Design a binder for this molecule. Structure first.
Ligand SMILES: [Zn+2]
Length: 136
């Protein structure tokens, strides 16, 4: 699989396009790709570590994501995140140590370092760089 590792924009079911990564080629009934969504917001969207190695017990009911098969025609280019609008008080999605993107709020911005206050009471304040923050 030569296409494996390609960053793209894939349709996620309302219709919304989200950044994804091509895992491999697979028929949809047209020629398609199996993709994994880049920014998981729930545990079920986290990529399955065992599936990517061909060692998962599950085919449909795994705790983690095995991705979605989309037709080549439905794919769009990878949409690079725009952090220009993101300032103090802006709502955002910030990456936590648990590996998920949680709803947060920027409390400060200092030369590409964003201090975020997570909406969830169970999560501490944190400092993230541009690779750990997304516009809402
Ligand atoms: Zn799995």
């Amino acid at each position: 699989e030569e296409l494996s590792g390609t960053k793209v924009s894939a349709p996620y079911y309302t219709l919304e396009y989200h950044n994804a990564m091509v895992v491999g080629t697979e028929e949809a009934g047209s020629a398609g790709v199996r993709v994994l969504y880049l920014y998981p917001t729930h545990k079920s969207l986290k990529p399955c570590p065992f599936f990517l190695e061909g060692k998962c017990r599950f085919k449909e009911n795994c705790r983690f994501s095995h991705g979605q098969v989309v037709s080549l025609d439905e794919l769009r280019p990878f949409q690079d995140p725009d952090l220009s609008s993101l300032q103090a008080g802006s709502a955002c999605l910030a990456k936590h140590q648990d590996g998920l993107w949680h709803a947060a709020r920027i409390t400060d911005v200092d030369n590409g370092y964003y201090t975020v206050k997570f909406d969830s009471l169970l999560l501490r304040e944190a400092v993230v760089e541009g690779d750990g923050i997304l516009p809402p």
